[PDB]
Design a protein around this ligand. Structure first.
Ligand SMILES: Cc1ccc2nc(-c3ccc(CNC(=O)c4cccnc4)cc3)oc2c1
Ligand SMILES: Cc1ccc2nc(-c3ccc(CNC(=O)c4cccnc4)cc3)oc2c1
Lengths: 466, 466
């Protein structure tokens, strides 16, 4: 069972003894610090609030479990048993904490406050930064959603230029990353962040998370299609790849079906098997049930161009209104190997230079989409900016001499949209002057209750592209 | 609640209709494919077996939940309800699967079979690769433990060369990565893998995982020390950094204490505050309660060298038997910023060139230790190598023409220890002759039961260095 008393950096156990005496308030904030990724999608905090922070999170058994662990962990008795018992007795195990945050799905430029945390009881000054570790992990859904959205910008640009519209954009980047992430929980978190921007996923864990913690009026927030893996091809034997292809496309004759075609020779498979031997089974397929050919090895751009060239010689290629080549509607391609934001850019530019419409292709991304990301990509950071000690408020900050990029903000913070539509974070409590509009940070958590929730539809709407 | 019917890649739902008709057996294996990191630590499978695969994992309610999700997910009725109902009725929801694996903690060279999976009921041919996604996630504990062990090799070599012994080696790489990983579950898994090689961690989640799933004869597998963060320094105000330092080292006068010293000026803190104003509180400390100075910004190597040079002018430095400089025993340093396996090598090499002993220092690693890792680092992969169709066993494999590095093995596999202590993987069932000895793969899971378990002490012994 999860125990919030055991869900922090070990050294934070010792911090209640280190603050200035008579500290009654510790006020801290989260930002994606300025160091491309000029704007970030704020997403994932609601999951953390509901799963870990709300309700009765302190019990007498959890206090004793933490006391016994930390006794051995530090070889010393430093655990603040009295502080946690105070929360258990006065608030029935509810955290005396207030959290204000920008609405989820909001797209905020780097270097702005995204949420703030402060204690609501003077006895619990130490609690604000106790939960830093749990809250900082929101870097991951933020970073997945942001990196996924940046790839949507690339796809939208090249889809618009080669087709004149954005039809099918929401299905052009498919989540392949279930096996390539570090845990089941990460898979669900990361997949849901990708679904902020797209509707195609094979990481089923993301569906249950959205349903339980955000909710959507759609039947499911993400969709997939029947498809083969190498095992369902290679199980037929090396000499019977054609029989495997024939069986699978016949089993799935009325729906879209993706067949991985590089088990032995992707180019042979496209030219001879799909393009000749089984060509009669492909050209008869409906527009809503195309064959999707999946290469999965080699240089991603060179393979895509070589596959398109081969398919263009065996199947009738037309030209769309913008003048770019378009496979017949019963034939599409997905490149699901070696795809990250960098190679995605190279492939669509390479296809455009060869006058291929992006309508022909979608992309599958696994580790590049959900795992090859770190907290340093957006510099997601949690810092104390304001304290009250013996009734005196003090604006606090760090400013390391050897790294000015690590300087943190001072005092009580607020986020505002200027009349020109820019964003500004006001420091030192200057938001009290009301020079701008209302503070964009709203109370989402207070004293054990989630006070403001967003549906997955609202988040998707807030995160739309221009 | 976890539902194994929803814990797979979406497209695997459709694979039972894609295998050759009358397929009764699908046999698959896991390896860290060939083409640094020449040997891998096998760790983490036992966690997956107990938490996700053992016991009654199929219920009628879970079948209905999966049926509803996949109906909307595919906009189609493709879910294999009949196959999962059979397992519920025939085996009381226990998976008819056998898994054989190398003992956890074993250090195996790349390109060897690590575990195999096969169905034990011919009706459940499809189940072997259904659970590929869950099992492939063992890449993460394998990769964390392997990458952590390689850093232990680097530290051991330079600690031995600069000091003549290995004292304190198991505390030279401390886990700082709780906030920098993608989820709570990842934190526990990754922290436990690091503790295979070291005993210093602040990611508390690793302790509970080891206690629940592996066990150790000591009360806890990992330890930490009291330490400050920037907030317990900066909360005193910029003009009172000295007062914060004094308060913290006095609170923790009899135990080791780490004080982050770069909030405003690391060089001022070492030269003026630690080196003059508070020097009398440091030189009086015990050898078992040193002050640990923590820089946290700037170039990691240059900052360490500049901090050590400053301390050498204010504190008595000796030269050890090997000829390297050594701080007094009441004063140590931890570099916990910008550390991964690459910068760790550069720092200890840089310290050696300046004649500084590794005895002086430990390293904290966060994202670099637990998050900046992907499945392609060791090429952890799961592939079907053997099937039975119409009573005929067929050795199957993939072999993409454009990437021979992705070729997979053929037939039934076994792992053997050579007389010289090497490892060899025999393919095509050729392991039955036992020319070098018994198969090192042992059944760890069969028909819903974990049949072989290892303690964390056994794993640590298996994963030790030469
Ligand atoms: C033009 C166009 C538009 C939209 C498309 N959607 C797909 C598509 C969706 C789903 C899958 C099945 N999943 C996998 O192959 C897989 C592989 C590795 C790990 N996990 C899953 C295949 C293809 O292709 C499209 C093409
Ligand atoms: C020579 C020597 C040997 C062994 C040592 N162990 C430490 C040491 C252990 C633990 C902590 C406290 N944790 C953190 O500072 C922290 C920072 C970020 C995220 N999470 C935690 C400090 C220092 O210093 C050593 C020095």
């Amino acid at each position: 069972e999860f125990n919030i008393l055991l869900a922090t950096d070990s050294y934070k156990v010792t911090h209640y003894k280190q603050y200035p005496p008579n500290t009654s308030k510790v006020y801290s904030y989260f930002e994606c610090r300025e160091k491309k990724y000029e704007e970030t999608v704020f997403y994932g905090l609601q999951y953390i609030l509901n799963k870990y922070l709300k309700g009765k999170v302190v019990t007498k058994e959890k206090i004793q479990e933490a006391k016994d662990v930390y006794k051995e962990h530090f070889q010393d008795d430093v655990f603040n048993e009295k502080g946690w018992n105070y929360i258990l007795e006065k608030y029935d195990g509810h955290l005396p904490i207030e959290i204000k945050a920008v609405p989820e799905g909001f797209v905020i430029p780097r270097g702005n406050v995204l949420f703030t945390v402060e204690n609501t009881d003077p006895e619990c000054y130490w609690l604000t930064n106790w939960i830093e570790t749990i809250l900082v992990q929101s870097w991951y859904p933020i970073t997945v959603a942001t990196n996924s959205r940046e790839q949507k910008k690339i796809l939208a640009k090249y889809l618009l230029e080669t087709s004149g519209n954005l039809d099918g954009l929401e299905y052009k980047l498919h989540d392949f990353g279930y096996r390539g992430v570090s845990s089941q929980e990460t898979a669900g978190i990361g997949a849901s962040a990708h679904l902020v921007n797209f509707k195609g996923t094979d990481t089923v864990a993301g569906l249950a998370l959205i349903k339980k913690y955000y909710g959507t009026k759609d039947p499911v927030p993400g969709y997939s299609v029947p498809a083969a893996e190498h095992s369902t091809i290679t199980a037929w034997g090396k000499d019977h790849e054609k029989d495997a292809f024939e069986h699978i496309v016949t089993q799935f004759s009325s729906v879209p079906v993706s067949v991985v075609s590089d088990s032995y020779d992707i180019y042979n498979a496209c030219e001879k098997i799909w393009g000749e031997d089984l060509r009669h089974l492909i050209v008869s397929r409906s527009t809503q049930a195309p064959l999707i050919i999946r290469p999965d090895s080699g240089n991603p751009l060179d393979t895509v161009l070589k596959v398109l060239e081969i398919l263009g010689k065996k199947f009738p290629v037309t030209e769309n209104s913008k003048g770019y080549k378009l496979l017949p509607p019963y034939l599409r391609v997905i490149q699901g190997d070696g795809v990250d934001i960098n190679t995605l850019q190279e492939i669509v530019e390479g296809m455009k230079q060869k006058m291929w419409s992006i309508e022909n292709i979608a992309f599958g991304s696994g580790g590049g989409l959900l795992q090859k990301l770190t907290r340093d990509l957006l510099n997601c950071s949690f810092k104390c900016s304001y304290v009250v000690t013996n009734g005196l408020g003090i604006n606090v900050f760090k400013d390391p001499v050897a790294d000015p990029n690590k300087r943190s903000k001072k005092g009580r913070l607020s986020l505002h949209r200027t009349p020109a539509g820019n964003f500004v974070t006001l420091e030192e409590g200057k938001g009290d002057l009301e020079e701008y509009g209302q503070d964009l940070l709203h109370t989402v958590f207070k004293n054990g209750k989630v006070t403001k929730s967003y549906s997955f539809d609202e988040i998707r709407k807030n995160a739309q592209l221009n």
